[PDB]
Amino acid sequence: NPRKRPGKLADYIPGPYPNEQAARAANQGALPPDLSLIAKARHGGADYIFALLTG
Amino acid sequence: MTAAEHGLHPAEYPWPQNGMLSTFDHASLRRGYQVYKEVCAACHSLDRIAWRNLVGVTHTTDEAKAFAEELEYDDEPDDEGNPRKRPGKLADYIPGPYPNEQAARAANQGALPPDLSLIAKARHGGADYIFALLTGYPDEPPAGVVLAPGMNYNPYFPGGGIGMARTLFDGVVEYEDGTPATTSQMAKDVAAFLTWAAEPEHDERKKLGLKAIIVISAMLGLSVYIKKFKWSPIKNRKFIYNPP
Amino acid sequence: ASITSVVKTSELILKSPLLSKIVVPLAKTYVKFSGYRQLGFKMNDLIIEETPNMQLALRRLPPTESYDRVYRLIRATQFSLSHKLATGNDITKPEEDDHYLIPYILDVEAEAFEKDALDNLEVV
Amino acid sequence: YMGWWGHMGSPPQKGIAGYTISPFAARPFAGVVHAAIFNTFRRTKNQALFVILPVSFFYYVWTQASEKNEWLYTKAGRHELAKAL
Amino acid sequence: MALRKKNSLLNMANSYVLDSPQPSNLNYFWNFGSLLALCLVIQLATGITLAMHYTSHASLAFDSVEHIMRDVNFGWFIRYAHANTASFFFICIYAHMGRNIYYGSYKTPRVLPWSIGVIIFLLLIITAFMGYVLVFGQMSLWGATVICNLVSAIPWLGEDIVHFLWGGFSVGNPTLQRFFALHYLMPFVLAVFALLHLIALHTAGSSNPLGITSNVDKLSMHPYYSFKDLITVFAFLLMFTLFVFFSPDKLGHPDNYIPANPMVTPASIVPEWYLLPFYAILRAIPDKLGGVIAMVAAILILLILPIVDRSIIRGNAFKPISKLLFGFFICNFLLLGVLGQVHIEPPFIVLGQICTIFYFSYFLILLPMVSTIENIFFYIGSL
Amino acid sequence: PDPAIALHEAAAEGPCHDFKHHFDECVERVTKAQEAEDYDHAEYKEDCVEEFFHLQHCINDNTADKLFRVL
Amino acid sequence: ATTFYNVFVKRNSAFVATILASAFVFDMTFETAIDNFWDRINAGKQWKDIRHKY
Amino acid sequence: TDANRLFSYFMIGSFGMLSAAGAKATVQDFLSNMSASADVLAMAKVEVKLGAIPLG
Ligand code: HEC
Ligand code: HEM
Ligand code: HEM
Ligand SMILES: CCCCCC[C@H]1C(=O)O[C@H](C)[C@H](NC(=O)c2cccc(NC=O)c2O)C(=O)O[C@@H](C)[C@@H]1OC(=O)CC(C)C
Ligand SMILES: CCCCCCCCCCCCO[C@@H]1O[C@H](CO)[C@@H](O[C@H]2O[C@H](CO)[C@@H](O)[C@H](O)[C@H]2O)[C@H](O)[C@H]1O
């Protein structure tokens, strides 16, 4: 039978949604990207994230 | 080691597919699939075979799609991201009886029934081993053998005690082609079927090998003529020596 | 090995009456079984020549002996590749199996080994 | 130690005449039947001992060893096995 | 001047495959060189093809090999060709080394091609061993476990080295990925050394079965050896065809069609047939470190043949005692092979020790004695 | 009715009669030995596996071809 | 016979063209011949032989 | 005679013919591994509903 355990240090930080479809359904169709690489995945890096959140 | 520890080595049976020019008997393969489906599939998976693999071997496309469409498989999530099931398609793999190893062992007094997709290649003996094993449960274990609990005596299995009980009895299957379903008949059919599962290229491979044998033999014969032809000046060389 | 070694050891054997009585018949049989004579070789034709010493000894052969050696090697190579043996006059008879090269290689080596010794001399 | 065509490093050759015929003028398989039978028999007879002696010896060794091993792991061989360990 | 001689690039091909001067009397045992070249080409072609379908992740490796067998067009052929040609590579390599020992190809002036050859032989062993692991079946895993735990016998640092090679504390995904990368690479290194041993040989040229100079009587490599090489290519492909198409699993071990399971240990961890003699040598020594040294020494001891052969004559064609000794040596090497696959039980334990002593004593005692005595017999016997 | 049942019986009574007798004798001995008390506290407990294998191996050699001929 | 030589063999361009055209014909006919032979020696065994039941 | 030369070239040409036929077979079979495999070819043929889809 399946089981759950408490998390350990080797575990990855878990996401808010089980899949893309759940993610989009909760965000009026838009898919919030994973943020692990977003600072390398946009021209601008930290500056882009800072500008976007404050802009 | 003792012969017990090795297991009795299986007889060499004359399988239809033994023989450089022989294919499988496809009628046997079809019967063997029916034995797998009605007997083995209760405990054993066949995870590497897709429904499409049966098509044009044992079943027509329609029969195989019918088999796939009777089952439910995991679909991609719906639009609210909830999980969904779909009917099976030909590209789906034949599903196993247990969700994981632990479920499998729990149902089989600890023993884990292996996947049968490769079992004919994964045991010394091949079809002969499968045939010998399924037909080789004696009515009574040899006097003095102590079987561990939940083990059955079978001399072909190394160590003698196998977690799988005898399963083939006369008329456990009703073949659709009117063949009498005797223990030996069903074992022969299922062993043929599993051999096909392990090596599905077998028929094509041996036909291409026949072509290869013929061409390569001819080229070997001709290469020897050509070598002897080109070398004949060197072999036929003669000398006359006059000391200076 | 050096030909000098072979020659010296052989002379020790031929001196000892006991040793020669048991070894010389063996060596004659060995050479019969060896079968180099069946390809028309003399024993000395088989000695490894890709050595500076042996190259020098071969250059010192009298022209006649050298030309004959070249013919025996070419003849044997042809029998080898044909998988035939020598017949008749091509077979080396025991009396024809002369050590034509041993004198030359012993002189070349004598000098080379003297040179090594003298390179290690210590004035007293 | 080996040169190239023209200066291969042969001692000077003189007095050898070599003759051969064209591959198109020869029967490539002349006397092949005689050779396949009589020549192969000659060459094999001459080399037979050098194969037979080592093969027969090592096969006998293996046969003795495999038969002993088989016998030690029988009921009859229980005691001899106990000593051997 | 002809283009093939004028142009620098063409001239290099010309010097190796066309105008190369060869002895006129090379027999069929000189053809294993080109068969090993053919094996190496088949392994590169099939190997690179399998690499296009194989996934090096341990969660997927075994499945990717099943995908090759079942889904890829002709995948069965490419897989079985690659697996069987590895066996044929070792048949040809043992034959080629056997030829070289029997005909004294290791003597001056060919010590360098021989010594590079011994390294090619080590790289082939490593290459084939790593390839075996990539399937990630039971024999793959249990092979990597036991063989990499031999390194644990290296004193002081042994354990550390093992963990470093595995990339972890056991054979697992890191090991599999790194063996994939290395198994891909090693055949290219092996090809380069194969080419170096030929360049080294070019200075002396091929030896020949009589062991005399061939400078007196040369034949161009083409067409004579070209057409002779085709005979053995077709003979090889006939044998290849019988295995690959008709009995593809005859040379292998069924245990590798069970997916790797670190818990369950298989009945019997025996290596692939061609490693078996070295495995027997290792079992013969009771000490773990001793065993490993002996096993490596069994290969490296070939490097001393140039010293321990004291004959004034190259090769065994004319040396009846050396031929007998060589026969015993070769048969003992096969008996070692057989003892590598029996169980560690009486009476094979003692027998394996005797065969191991015989193997080493050939190089260390018998060959030096026998070659010295034959020198004396040739000289006295021809007086 | 399973063809193998009859073929195995025929091969036991016929070409493998000597092996059948061995196995039989063995079982008699072992059963009798188990019947005797302080059998559980014995060092060596005899089986009949060896004899069984000899019999089965023989039966299979005399039956294999015949059995596949009737399927 | 000289004619045959002159046409198909004398020029290498012609000889290689003849070899490749022969290879094409051999390839096609050999395929067909093996197919038929394989079907006769494996009669009633293959899927094509039992397919009619379905 | 031309007959004589022609015979030996028939042997050489037969050998070239089988080598050409064999090379074509080898190449064609071997490179077909690179064509879509059976699992890929099965993931064609996607079936889709239309009941879900609104106008516009
Ligand atoms: C209800 C259970 C059950 C049924 C029915 C069953 N098996 Fe098994 N089988 C097992 C178990 C459990 C094992 C593992 C036994 C062990 O490892 O001790 C097993 C093992 C095997 C093995 C491999 C033995 C080995 O060497 O590891 C083969 C082959 C096999 N089964 C084939 C079949 C075939 C063919 C059928 C029916 C036609 C079949 N089984 C029916 C439970 C079953
Ligand atoms: C990939 C592996 C190898 C390839 C492709 C290869 C190829 C060849 C070729 C083509 C030749 C010349 C032709 C011949 O004599 O057969 C040759 C000669 C030779 N090889 Fe190898 N070889 C390989 C491995 C080895 C090994 C492992 C050794 C030694 C342990 C070795 C030692 C030699 C020697 C000494 C010669 C010279 C022999 C002579 O002509 O007398 N080679 N090799
Ligand atoms: C000397 C050359 C080579 C040898 C001796 C060799 C040997 C092997 C062996 C023995 C295996 C195990 C085979 C099995 O049982 O399935 C194997 C697997 C493999 N080899 Fe090689 N190999 C060689 C070259 C290559 C090369 C150049 C590649 C290029 C990538 C390669 C890729 C693979 C792959 C992907 C596998 C795993 C798939 C499989 O097992 O079939 N090999 N190799
Ligand atoms: C194309 C030019 C590049 C030079 C290297 C290519 C290859 C090359 O030289 O081919 C030759 C045909 C060679 N054979 C011989 O020496 C040979 C010599 C004497 C007698 C016989 N046989 C008797 O009857 C021979 O078989 C051979 O097979 O050796 C390969 C290994 C070489 O490959 C490489 O090293 C590169 C890499 C692929 C390993
Ligand atoms: C240096 C290379 C030059 C470029 C040449 C490009 C070649 C690439 C061609 C791949 C062609 C494959 O095309 C396909 O071949 C396979 C065999 O492989 C044939 O398949 C046929 O024979 C095979 C066995 O040979 C059977 O498995 C199959 O049932 C049958 O249909 C197909 O009828 C053909 O559709």
Q: How many domains is chain C built from?
A: 1
Q: Can you tell me whether residue B244 is helix, strand or coil?
A: coil
CA B161, CA B109: separation in Å to the nearest integer?
Answer: 13
Q: Are strands B161-162 and B238-241 parallel, antiparallel or unpaired?
A: unpaired
Give rounded-to-5 percent helix, strand, coil for chain H: 65, 0, 35
CB contact burial E176-187 (16+ within 10 A = b; e otherwise): bbbbbeebbebb
CA D40, CA D45: separation in Å to the nearest integer?
Answer: 8
* Dihedral sign, Cα of residue B162, residue B165, residue B169, residue B172: negative
The DSSP 8-state label assigned to residue C96 in this structure reads: G
Does the Cβ of B191 fall within 6 Å of ligand 1? no
Q: Do B175 and B193 belong to one domain?
A: yes
Q: Are strands E21-23 and E218-220 parallel, antiparallel or unpaired?
A: antiparallel
- Tokens 């005679």 appear where? H1
Q: Residues of C with CB below 8 A from D15's CB?
A: 67, 71
CA E126, CA G40: separation in Å to the nearest integer?
Answer: 47
| Catalytic residue (one of E34, E64, E140, E229) | E229
* E67 neighbors B49 (Cβ within 8 angstroms): no
Q: Do B117 and B97 belong to one domain?
A: yes
Whether chains G and H touch (3+ CB pairs under 8 A) is answered by: yes
- The residue among B180, B171, B170, B145 whose CA lies nearest residue B159 is B145
Q: Do B127 and B137 belong to one domain?
A: yes
* E337 neighbors E276 (Cβ within 8 angstroms): yes
Q: Do B241 and B193 belong to one domain?
A: no
What are the tokens at F3? 């063809």
CA atoms within 13 A on the CB side of F69: 6
Single-letter code of the amino acid located at B16 = P
- Tokens 């005979």 appear where? E231
What does each C-alpha distance from E298 to B110, E127, E194 come to in angstroms?
Answer: 45, 18, 21
Which helix (H) or strand (E) segment holds residue E23: the answer is strand E21-23
Residues 10-29 of F with CB under 8 A from B: 23, 26-27
Note the helical H segments in E202-249: 221-241
Single-letter code of the amino acid located at E103 = Y
Whether chains D and C touch (3+ CB pairs under 8 A) is answered by: yes
* B127 neighbors B15 (Cβ within 8 angstroms): yes
What angle, rounded to 10 degrees, do the helices at E348-361 and E288-300 form? 40
- What residues contact A35, with CB distance under 8 A and at least 6 apart? none
* E322 neighbors E261 (Cβ within 8 angstroms): no
The Cα angle at residue E242 between residues E239 and E243, in degrees rounded to 5:
90
- What residues contact D58, with CB distance under 8 A and at least 6 apart? E328, E331, E332, E334, E335
Single-letter code of the amino acid located at C92 = T
Which helix (H) or strand (E) segment holds residue E90: the answer is helix E75-102
CA E257, CA E283: separation in Å to the nearest integer?
Answer: 26
- Tokens 């070349």 appear where? C108
Give me the DSSP letters along B64-77.
Answer: HHHHHHTSEEEPPP
- What residues contact B26, with CB distance under 8 A and at least 6 apart? B57, B58, G45, G46, G47, G49, G50
Determination approach:
cryo-EM
Please tell me the distance between residue B93's alpha carbon and the centre of ligand 3 in angstroms.
Answer: 28
What are the tokens at A28? 């009026």
CA G36, CA B210: separation in Å to the nearest integer?
Answer: 13
Beta bridge partners of residue B73, listed in sequence order: B86
CA atoms within 13 A on the CB side of E311: 30
Quick check: B78 and A21 CB within 8 A? yes
Rg (CA), chain H: 26
Q: Are strands B72-74 and E21-23 parallel, antiparallel or unpaired?
A: unpaired
E287 is annotated as an active-site residue: no
Considering all CA atoms of chain E, what is the largest pairwise distance in Å, rounded to the nearest integer? 74
- Number of neighbours of residue C1 by Cβ within 10 angstroms: 16
Considering all CA atoms of chain G, what is the largest pairwise distance in Å, rounded to the nearest integer? 60
What are the tokens at C57? 């000894």
Which helix (H) or strand (E) segment holds residue B240: the answer is strand B238-241
Single-letter code of the amino acid located at B119 = I
CA C36, CA D41: separation in Å to the nearest integer?
Answer: 19
* B34 neighbors B41 (Cβ within 8 angstroms): no
Q: Are strands E21-23 and D16-19 parallel, antiparallel or unpaired?
A: unpaired
- The residue among E194, E150, B3 whose CA lies nearest residue F48 is B3
- DSSP strand E in B63-222: where? 72-74, 85-87, 152-153, 161-162
- What residues contact E34, with CB distance under 8 A and at least 6 apart? E229, E232, E233
Is residue B129 marked as binding? yes
CA B221, CA B235: separation in Å to the nearest integer?
Answer: 19
CA F19, CA F25: separation in Å to the nearest integer?
Answer: 10
- Tokens 């008879």 appear where? C93
The Cα angle at residue B130 between residues B126 and B133, in degrees rounded to 5:
135
Tell whether omega for the bond before E347 is within 30 degrees of 0, i.e. cis.
yes
What are the tokens at B97? 């009886």
Which helix (H) or strand (E) segment holds residue B239: the answer is strand B238-241
- The residue among E102, E98, C80 whose CA lies nearest residue D43 is C80
What are the tokens at B52? 């499409």
CA E22, CA E96: separation in Å to the nearest integer?
Answer: 17
G12, G15, G17, G23: CA torsion to nearest 10: -140
Burial (Cβ within 10 Å: 0-12, 13-18, ≥19) of residue B218: middle
Backbone φ, ψ for residue E252 (5° rounding):
-105, -175
- DSSP strand E in D10-78: where? 16-19
- Number of neighbours of residue D40 by Cβ within 10 angstroms: 11
What are the tokens at A43? 């021209």
CB contact burial D41-73 (16+ within 10 A = b; e otherwise): eeeeeeeeebeeebeeebeebbeebeebbeebb
Mutate to test the pocket of ligand 4, among E8, E10, E16, E96 (most ligand atoms within 8 A of CB): E16
The DSSP 8-state label assigned to residue B6 in this structure reads: H
Search chain F and give the residue with CA nearest D71: F50
- Number of neighbours of residue B75 by Cβ within 10 angstroms: 11
Whether residue B241 lies within 8 A of chain C, CB to CB, comes out as yes
Backbone φ, ψ for residue E240 (5° rounding):
-55, -50
CA E50, CA E68: separation in Å to the nearest integer?
Answer: 8
The Cα angle at residue E72 between residues H47 and H17, in degrees rounded to 5:
125
* E184 neighbors E178 (Cβ within 8 angstroms): no
CA E13, CA E3: separation in Å to the nearest integer?
Answer: 12
Calculate how close chain B gets to D69, using CA atoms only, in Å: 9
Beta bridge partners of residue B161, listed in sequence order: B153
**E89 CA closest ligand 3 atom index:** 5
Single-letter code of the amino acid located at B15 = W
Give me the DSSP letters along C43-75.
Answer: GGGGB---SHHHHHHHHTS-HHHHHHHHHHHHH
- What residues contact D75, with CB distance under 8 A and at least 6 apart? F46, F50
Quick check: D53 and E19 CB within 8 A? no
CA–chain centroid gap for C71, Å, is: 17
What are the tokens at B131? 């045939």
Counting every residue written for chain H, the total comes to 56
Indicate the resolution in Å.
Answer: 3.0
- What are the CB-based long-range contacts (under 8 Å, 24+) for B108-111? B108/B43, B108/B163, B108/B164, B109/B149, B109/B150, B109/B163, B110/B150, B110/B163, B111/B150, B111/B163, B111/B164
CA A2, CA E112: separation in Å to the nearest integer?
Answer: 64
What does each C-alpha distance from D36 to B221, C83, E1, E224 come to in angstroms?
Answer: 16, 11, 44, 22
Q: Are strands B152-153 and D16-19 parallel, antiparallel or unpaired?
A: unpaired
Question: How do the domains of chain F map onto residue ranges?
Answer: 1-71
Indicate which residue's Cα is closest to atom 13 of ligand 1.
B113
What are the tokens at E228? 């002779």
CA C94, CA C74: separation in Å to the nearest integer?
Answer: 21
The DSSP 8-state label assigned to residue B115 in this structure reads: P
Is residue B164 marked as binding? yes
Q: Are strands B152-153 and B161-162 parallel, antiparallel or unpaired?
A: antiparallel
What are the tokens at D12? 């000077």
Which of the ligands is closest to the CA of residue B183? 1
To test the contact with chain H by mutation, choose from D21, D22, D24 the residue with the greatest count of H C-beta atoms within 10 A, namely D24
CA B192, CA B197: separation in Å to the nearest integer?
Answer: 9
Give rounded-to-5 percent helix, strand, coil for chain D: 55, 5, 40
- Number of neighbours of residue E52 by Cβ within 10 angstroms: 11
* B123 neighbors F9 (Cβ within 8 angstroms): no
Q: Can you tell me whether residue E34 is helix, strand or coil?
A: helix
* B33 neighbors B49 (Cβ within 8 angstroms): no
* B243 neighbors C68 (Cβ within 8 angstroms): yes
Whether residue G22 lies within 8 A of chain H, CB to CB, comes out as yes
Burial (Cβ within 10 Å: 0-12, 13-18, ≥19) of residue B128: buried
Q: Residues of D with CB below 8 A from C50's CB?
A: 1
E309 is annotated as an active-site residue: no
CA atoms within 13 A on the CB side of C80: 26
What does each C-alpha distance from E276 to B10, E190, E279, E335 come to in angstroms?
Answer: 26, 21, 5, 10
CA–chain centroid gap for F31, Å, is: 15
CA B85, CA C7: separation in Å to the nearest integer?
Answer: 93
Single-letter code of the amino acid located at E273 = W
CA E328, CA D51: separation in Å to the nearest integer?
Answer: 9
* C102 neighbors C96 (Cβ within 8 angstroms): no
* Distance separating the N- and C-terminal Cα atoms of chain H: 86
The Cα angle at residue E213 between residues E209 and E219, in degrees rounded to 5:
75
- Number of neighbours of residue A2 by Cβ within 10 angstroms: 6
Quick check: D78 and F44 CB within 8 A? yes
H helix count then E strand count, chain E? 16, 2
Quick check: E24 and B234 CB within 8 A? yes
Give rounded-to-5 percent helix, strand, coil for chain G: 80, 0, 20
Question: How do the domains of chain G map onto residue ranges?
Answer: 1-54
Counting every residue written for chain D, the total comes to 85
- DSSP strand E in B37-102: where? 72-74, 85-87
H helix count then E strand count, chain D? 3, 1
What are the tokens at B57? 């071997």
* Dihedral sign, Cα of residue B130, residue B134, residue B136, residue B137: positive
What angle, rounded to 10 degrees, do the helices at C3-15 and E367-382 form? 70
CA D64, CA E366: separation in Å to the nearest integer?
Answer: 26
CA D60, CA E331: separation in Å to the nearest integer?
Answer: 12
Q: Residues of A with CB below 8 A from B80's CB?
A: 21-22, 25
- DSSP strand E in chain D: where? 16-19
- DSSP strand E in B75-177: where? 85-87, 152-153, 161-162
Residues 208-247 of E with CB under 8 A from D: 213, 215-216, 218
* E256 neighbors E135 (Cβ within 8 angstroms): yes
Q: Do B232 and B191 belong to one domain?
A: no
CA B169, CA B171: separation in Å to the nearest integer?
Answer: 6
CA E35, CA E44: separation in Å to the nearest integer?
Answer: 14
What are the tokens at E382? 């021809």
CA E180, CA E56: separation in Å to the nearest integer?
Answer: 6
Give me the DSSP letters along A1-55.
Answer: --------TTSPPPPSSSSHHHHHHTTTT--PPPSSSTTTSSTTTHHHHHHHHH-
Is residue A48 marked as binding? yes
CA E83, CA E248: separation in Å to the nearest integer?
Answer: 9
- What residues contact B240, with CB distance under 8 A and at least 6 apart? D16, D17, D19
Q: How many domains is chain B built from?
A: 2
Does the Cβ of E107 fall within 6 Å of ligand 3? no
The DSSP 8-state label assigned to residue B165 in this structure reads: P
What's the domain range around B236? 201-244
